Amino acid sequence: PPGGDMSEPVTQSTLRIVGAFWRLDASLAFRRHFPAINWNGSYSLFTSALDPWYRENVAEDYPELRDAISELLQREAGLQEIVQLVGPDALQDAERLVIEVGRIIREDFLQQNAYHEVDAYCSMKKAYGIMKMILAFYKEAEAAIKRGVSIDEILQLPVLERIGRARYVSEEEFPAYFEEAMKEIQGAFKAL
Amino acid sequence: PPGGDMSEPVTQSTLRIVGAFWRLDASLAFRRHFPAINWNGSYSLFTSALDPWYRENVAEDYPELRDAISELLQREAGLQEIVQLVGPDALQDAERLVIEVGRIIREDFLQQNAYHEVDAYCSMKKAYGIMKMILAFYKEAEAAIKRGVSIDEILQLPVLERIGRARYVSEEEFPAYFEEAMKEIQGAFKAL
Amino acid sequence: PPGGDMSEPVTQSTLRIVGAFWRLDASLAFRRHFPAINWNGSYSLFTSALDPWYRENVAEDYPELRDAISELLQREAGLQEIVQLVGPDALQDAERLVIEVGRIIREDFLQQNAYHEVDAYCSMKKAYGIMKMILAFYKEAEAAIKRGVSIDEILQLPVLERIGRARYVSEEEFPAYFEEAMKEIQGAFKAL
Amino acid sequence: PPIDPLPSLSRLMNNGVGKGKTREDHKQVSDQLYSAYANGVDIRKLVAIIGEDALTENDRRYLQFADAFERFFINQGQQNRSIEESLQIAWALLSMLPQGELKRISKDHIGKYY
Amino acid sequence: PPIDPLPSLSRLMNNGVGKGKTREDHKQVSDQLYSAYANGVDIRKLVAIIGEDALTENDRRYLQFADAFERFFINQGQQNRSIEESLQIAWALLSMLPQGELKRISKDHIGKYY
Amino acid sequence: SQVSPTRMNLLQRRGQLRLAQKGVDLLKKKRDALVAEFFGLVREAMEARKALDQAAKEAYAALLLAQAFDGPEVVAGAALGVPPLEGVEAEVENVWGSKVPRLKATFPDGALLSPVGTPAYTLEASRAFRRYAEALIRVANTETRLKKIGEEIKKTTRRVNALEQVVIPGIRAQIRFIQQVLEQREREDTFRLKRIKGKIEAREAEEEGG
């Protein structure tokens, strides 16, 4: 932005009525994000005409899997506000469910490096795969916690580390990597 | 003004030049009790110099009523909040007293209709007796709690109803209703 | 400051080029602390070129002692912050230690009477003396209070009051407290 | 379309319509769903910020109100509606709620439609 | 008249008066009231920060020094008051904190003005 | 000294209000819920208490001199009728001010297992043991609740004070300062802009007047 403000004409008139907007901060990109995107502040102005092509070419449940990731990623903002308010101090299971999930989504999934071909570079099956990896683990956490399994013990699993090893894996390897990991999800969750 | 702001010229100039500001609140309005004038956000610096000329022409005890009675709203504003959250019955008999008088001020001396033309026509003599009765009902309320008179029967007196029927006549039936209404307070705290 | 900020060019000329700079505050001025120096917006570059002349005439036990006073109000800052987040009943003996050192460093060391002219002029003799008084208290107080004597009791002792006379004293009344109180600080505070 | 709770209001809404021109019950139904929607927005995220160590029936039911109010009432797809079908939705959802949480609509109107 | 000299600054206050130019204890009771009163209102700040209390027994005296200064001294109507009537009675309101060793006053007007 | 930006930051201080103004709306009826239901437990607490207190002491106080060496007897003969170290039933409990542990006084206490003393007062005294164990649970969960609500109160009341002092009017007053100085810059704009125009008209008046 020329003025540092984005309320200025030239920004809105063709640089924000555009097909996509991603905002950035200075301490955003410093952690390990390059190129960064915001978690909340990024919306998509045209996506409702790009769904056909995504359905057919990529995966037929792909407009389902991106809306269900973003849903958490952006609802997290709900909690961000109460932090900067009185602060949440009511640790509850359904509480710390959103918190820790979303956190890892910003730590490993928005942290991508355009410097390596294992932290970035994506084809259909890699872009497909990762985005379902998280969903599943999250899904299984939802029904885990409901019985009375603490989020502490979910954190100290080796499956937390698998999502942590889903940004140092190549596209080629990606296929067989994902096919082995789907079993470690269902094992270390349903059973407990 | 566009916000309600004072950093716009028009407001911060008028503000000293003209001595009175009459804010109405949206909440105060929505319940159907008019006027809806928010008192903490209204003021009239005129009142000072008019206090001579008020009592001179209107009525002798007229100023004496206004200034005195306004204390009701002040100890009611910070009372409703979250101090009578637990019901008024679990509070002191001096903090109860405030809502006992509170009934007459809110159903008599603040309720009016712009749909009914027999109550909206008001004048000096009508408004003056209404404010007056609520002084003479605090003087008898507070003598009620000094004798330990129950807050079940004071809230069911005929006395309250006797105020209510005298806001449904413009000023014609008002004189005769003040003959009966005044003395009724007098013999309903003395009938208990 | 025109705007009350030093961002305006008429104010940043003593902070455009570097040297020393002092920070005088309104809030200090109100209780009538003369001078109003604050250690939150003042630096000096004659702390790398008065070190020679100090240990040539003044003392070599001075380039250290001066610093050892500044750390006092360094550590008061970190804590002052937390005083405003939660009271002195959340903070321990050792917390309040450097807080009520800080107190005498300001009560009797940031206030100097403008109607006693022997505090409107000082000398090195006045300097080094009263810097060494505090040295003792600290270094002693770290062991005194480690015996579980709560800061409450040390507030009631006469020991504070005697050191506190330092803005009503003369310079010809300077050997009255110099040698005298020196022994009483290290002496009758570790027994009593 | 996304329309806020208390932040949104249209300055005129009853001087172009009357009773039986947009239906008679409309009058008080129009100022129900203002105060009735606006109440669920106060616990539409607070259900674990008020813990599971105090939870009441009334406000709980006011979460379920919201979810069905945004799904069915606000959104109605690109499918067409009329005054009478857009009124149906409002009543139906309020039917979960008791008579004791309905306060902005008269018993007269309730004796027409519930 | 409401008078709050919390962020005030009186530049001169011992010049243009002295002792015997007004009264003896005028020069002394100048700064006294200031900080006695000041530190009254100060308490009400930090009590509420940590629960609803934070007060000590060396607080209960400064606390009431702000009530004592309140409607007794600040409130007066439009009633003329001499420098005598003011300072004289100011010292009986300086009998709410233990006398003799006061912040700006010492024993030189204590035993003379009660 | 150190001062923040004034047009980058413009965007954040408008958003300060959206977070703040809306934020404190819901803060009000939030804490009110927990404190509302709390009252119930305080009233209800004394229910069993008053009842079982006076029949607890009843037998107790009417025995000391006949016994005082049969303390030994009741503890000995007991088969796990009194746990001296960590016999309590400690409970974990999540609340606003994190994991605070609570607990209930539930251990075996026993009833009419005492011999010697005074034939009638003994038996009675042993029966009284129910009215220790049981009653103490009441206070075990109501007084502990008291401490949980301590946290709540402190953190809470802290925010009220702050809000009404430094917070609200301070973040208000910031806008003003911002606004007025950026606006004021555009004084210099106009006076120059004027003078720029004066040059354009003058130059063409050195074609039509000189």
Q: Provide DSSP, A99-114.
A: HHHHHHHHHTSS--BT
Q: Where are the alpha helices (DSSP H) in B40-123?
A: 47-57, 62-69, 71-83, 93-107
Nearest to F63 by CA among F148, F134, F123, F144: F123
- For residue B32, give every residue at least 6 positions away whose Cβ sits within 8 Å of its Cβ, in sequence order, or none: B113
Q: What is the 3-state secondary structure (H, E, C) of chain F?
A: CCCCCCCCCHHHHHHHHHHHHHHHHHHHHHHHHHHHHHHHHHHHHHHHHHHHHHHHHHHHCCCCCCCCCCHHHHHHHCCCCCCCCCCCEEEEEEEECEEEEEEECCCCCCCCCCCCCCHHHHHHHHHCCHHHHHHHHHHHHHHHHHHHHHHHHHHHHHHHHHHHHHHHHHHHHHHHHHHHHHHHHHHHHHHHHHHHHHHHHHHCCCCCCC
Listed residue (C66, C14, C11) closest to C42, CA to CA: C14
- F154 touching chain E per CB within 8 A: yes
Give the rounded distance of the alpha carbon of D103 from its chain centre: 12
User: Of the candidates F32, F39, F176, which has its C-beta nearest B82's C-beta?
Assistant: F32
How far CA F60 is from CA of C110, C118, F53, F111, F116, in Å, comes to 66, 75, 11, 13, 14
The DSSP letter of residue A34 is: B
CB contact under 8 A, D54 and F37: yes
* Cβ neighbourhood burial of F96 (10 Å; 0-12, 13-18, 19+): buried
Spatial distance between the Cα atoms of A142 and F208, rounded to a whole number of angstroms: 84
Is the CB of F158 less than 8 angstroms away from the CB of E52?
no
Cis peptide before A158 (omega within 30 of 0): no
- Spatial separation of the C-alpha atoms in residues D87 and D110, rounded to whole Å: 13
Backbone angles phi and psi of A3, in degrees to 5: -100, -15
CA C191 to CA C149: how far, in whole Å?
11
- CB contact (8 A) between residue C29 and residue E8: no
Q: Nearest Cα to E57, choosing from C85, C155, C80?
A: C155
Neighbours of A145 (CB within 10 A): 18
Answer whether D51 sits within 8 Å of F34, measured CB to CB. yes
Closest CA to B73 of B21, B19, B110: B110
| Gap between the Cα atoms of E10 and B92, Å rounded | 46
Asked if A1 contacts A8 with a C-beta cutoff of 8 angstroms, the reply is yes
Q: How far lies F121's CA from each of A66, F57, F60, F78, F116, in Å?
A: 77, 11, 8, 19, 10
User: Do F and D count as touching (3 or more CB pairs closer than 8 A)?
Assistant: yes
Tell how far CA B54 is from the center of its chain: 19
User: Measured between alpha carbons, how far is B86 from B90 in angstroms, rounded to an integer?
Assistant: 7
Q: Which amino acid is at B177?
A: Y
F173, two tokens: 């007053």
Classify residue E97 as left (phi > 0), alpha (psi -120 to 50) or beta: beta
Residue of A11, A81, A83, A86 for testing the chain F interface, max F β-carbons within 10 Å? A86
Contact assignment for F157 to E51 by CB distance below 8 Å: yes
Chain F residue at shortest CA distance from D56: F33
Per-residue tokens: B89: 């019955």
Q: Could you give the C-alpha distances from C82 to A29, A84, C79, C154, D102, in angstroms and in order?
A: 31, 17, 5, 23, 48
**Six-digit token string for C192:** 């009593």
In 3D space, the residue among B80, B81, B86, B85 whose CA is nearest the CA of residue B98 turns out to be B80
Least Cα distance to D65 among D36, D27, D100, D85 occurs for D36
Spatial CB neighbours of C166, under 8 Å, sequence gap ≥ 6: C108, C109, C130, C177
Question: Please, are residues A150 and A91 in contact by the beta-carbon 8 Å criterion?
Answer: no
B9 contacts on F by Cβ (under 8 Å): none
The structure was resolved to a resolution in Å of 9.5
**Chain A interface, Cβ < 8 Å to F:** 3-7, 81-82, 84-87, 89-92
CATH code at position B150: 1.10.1140.10
Burial C158-177 (b: 16+ CB within 10 A, else e): ebbeebeebeebeeeeeeeb
Measuring CA to CA, which residue among F25, B43, F193 is closest to residue D43? Answer: F25
- Contacts with E51 from chain F: Cβ below 8 Å: 150, 153-154, 157
CB C144, CB C190: distance < 8 Å: yes
Cβ atoms of residues F111 and F127 within 8 Å? yes
What chain F residue is nearest to B6 in terms of C-alpha separation?
F176
The approach used to solve this structure was: cryo-EM
Beta pairing partners, A43: A21
Interface test with C, best of E31, E50, E102 (most C CBs within 10 A): E50
**Do chain C and B touch: 3 or more Cβ pairs under 8 angstroms?**
no
With contact defined as 3+ CB pairs under 8 Å, the chains touching B are F
CATH dotted code for F1-210: 1.10.287.3240
Measure CB to CB from residue E9 to each of C30, C86, C89 and give the nearest one: C30
Structure tokens that stand for F176 in this block = 């003003």
In terms of C-beta distances under 8 Å and separation of at least 24 residues, what long-range contacts does C57-64 make, across chains too? C58/C124, C58/C128, C59/C124, C59/C128, C61/C128, C62/C128
How far is residue B101's CA from residue B79's CA, in Å, rounded to a whole number? 14
Does a cis peptide bond (omega within 30 degrees of 0) precede residue D98? no
> For residue C89, which residues of chain E lie inside 8 Å, CB to CB?
50, 54
Residues forming beta bridges with residue F98, ordered by sequence position: F95
Residue B43 main-chain phi, psi, to 5 deg: -165, 165
Q: Name the token pair of C128.
A: 């080094």
Residues F163 and E113: their CA atoms lie apart, in Å, by 43
Distance CA C117, CA C122 (A): 9
Q: Residue B119's Cα: distance from chain center in Å?
A: 16
Using alpha carbons only, give the angle E38, E41, E45 rounded to the nearest 5 degrees. 130
Nearest to A130 by CA among A69, A57, A60: A69
Q: How far apart are CA C189 and CA C161, in angstroms?
A: 13
Q: What are F24's two structure tokens?
A: 């404190």
Q: Helix F10-60 vs helix F130-162: angle between axes, to the nearest 10 degrees?
A: 160
Going from N- to C-terminal start, the domains of chain F cover 1-210
Q: ∠ at Cα A77 (A76, A79), nearest 5°?
A: 70
Q: Which residues contact E76 (CB under 8 A, 6 or more apart)?
A: E1
> Is the Cβ–Cβ distance between E98 and E31 less than 8 Å?
no
- Please check whether residue B137 is in contact with residue B101, taking contact to mean a CB–CB distance below 8 angstroms: yes
Which chains are within 8 Å of F by 3+ CB pairs? A, B, C, D, E
CA distance B163 to B181: 7
B-F contacts (CB, under 8 Å): 10
Which residue in B7, B85, B86 is closest to F176 by CB distance?
Answer: B7
Q: A82: distance to nearest CA of chain D, Å?
A: 9
- How far is it, in rounded angstroms, from Cα C111 to Cα B90? 52
Q: For residues F31 and D42, give the distance between their C-alpha atoms in angstroms, rounded to a whole number.
A: 13
F75 vs F56: CA distance, rounded Å? 19
Give the count of beta carbons closer than 10 Å to the beta carbon of residue A33.
18
DSSP C97-148: HHHHHHTHHHHTTT---SS-SSSSS--HHHHHHHHHHHHHHHHHHHHHGGGT
Rounded CA-CA distance A127/A66 in Å is: 10
Using DSSP, state whether B20 is helix, strand or coil: strand
Nearest to F30 among D50, D52, D56 (CB): D50
CA–CA distance, A171 with A117 (Å, rounded to integer): 8
Radius of gyration of chain F measured on its C-alpha atoms: 37
Check if the beta carbon of residue C79 is closer than 8 Å to that of residue C98.
yes
Contact E9 C29 (CB under 8 A): yes
Burial readout A44-65 (b: 16 or more C-beta within 10 A, e: otherwise): eeeeeeeeeeeeeebbeebbeb
Interface test with E, best of F161, F166, F167 (most E CBs within 10 A): F161
Q: Which residues contact B147 (CB under 8 A, 6 or more apart)?
A: none
Q: Do A95 and D50 touch (CB under 8 A)?
A: no
Kindly write down the DSSP assignment for every residue of C24-68, as one continuous string. Answer: B-HHHHHHT-SS-B-TTS-B-S-SSSSHHHIIIII-SSSTTTTHH
The answer to whether the peptide bond before residue B35 is cis (omega within 30 degrees of 0) is yes
Domain that holds residue A51: 45-192
Nearest-neighbour CA in chain F from C69: distance (Å): 23
- Give me the count of residues in chain D: 114
| Nearest-neighbour CA in chain F from B91: distance (Å) | 13
Written as six digits, the tokens of D38 are: 């606006």
CB contact under 8 A, F35 and B85: yes
Q: Tell me the two tokens of residue D77.
A: 């797809």
* C-alpha D98 chain-centroid distance: 13
Angle A171-A177-A179 from CA coordinates, rounded to 5°: 120
Question: Residue D114: what residue type?
Answer: Y
Are chains C and D touching, using the cut-off of 8 Å on CB pairs and a minimum of 3 such pairs? Answer: no
Residue type at position B110: L
CB contact under 8 A, A88 and D49: yes
* Residue of D41, D46, D47, D49 to mutate when probing chain A, most A C-beta within 10 A: D49
CA distances to C137, E51, F151 from C79, in Å: 20, 19, 21
Interface with chain F: mutation pick from D50, D60, D62, highest number of F CBs within 10 Å: D50
Sign of CA dihedral B82, B83, B86, B89: negative
DSSP secondary structure string for all residues of B78-97: HHHHHHSTT-GGGS-HHHHH
Q: d(Cα F200, Cα F96) in Å, to the nearest integer?
A: 70
Q: Do chains C and E touch (3 or more CB pairs under 8 A)?
A: yes
Query: For residue D7, what is the enclosing H or E element?
Result: none
Report the run of H or E that residue E110 belongs to, with start and end: none
The two most distant CA atoms of chain A are separated, in Å, by: 57
Smallest CA–CA separation between F32 and chain B, in Å? 8
Residues 112..151 of C with a Cβ closer than 8 Å to E: which? 115
> Are A4 and F27 a contacting pair at CB < 8 A?
no
